[PDB]
Amino acid sequence: KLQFALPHETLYSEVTQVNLPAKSGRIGVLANHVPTVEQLLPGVVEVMEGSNSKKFFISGGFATVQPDSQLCVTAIEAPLESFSENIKNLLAEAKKNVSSSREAAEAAIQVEVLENLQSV
């Protein structure tokens, strides 16, 4: 079972195969899995129910396989196609931001986010 809930939505809140991108690379959960807690990095996420696959762009969060086979995914915001050009313009602004100043870290996250979006 998968429970995917966000502070403004409830998505998948069983689910056949789920692929999640975590600070440990990528983790896939199918049935029982070891009941770890792993922090989700800014991500492209796929959730598959049967063979049907739905693709989510996930802002990072935390993932926890519960020892009862409940995949708790919580993250700040997301479908993938909806996120998708103007942001590519925005990264140019963000590059400028790296130059001036906390803003560096912010802009670094922005570089990660454009890169991740360009990746898909």
């Binding site: 800014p42 762009f57 700040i76 915001e77 942001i87 870290a105 922005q110 986010v113």
Partner: protein, 48 residues
Amino acid sequence: ISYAAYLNVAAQAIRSTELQTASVLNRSQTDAFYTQYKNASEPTPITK
């Protein structure tokens, strides 16, 4: 930069494509003033 701040900036970036609803844009708007206090005494209030 706290862990949740790290996620926060990422979320803000994600609201950038332009097809997005007003409520999304509203969730990115904020308005607050963290007013520090001590002892009674109040060090000045400043926006988040």
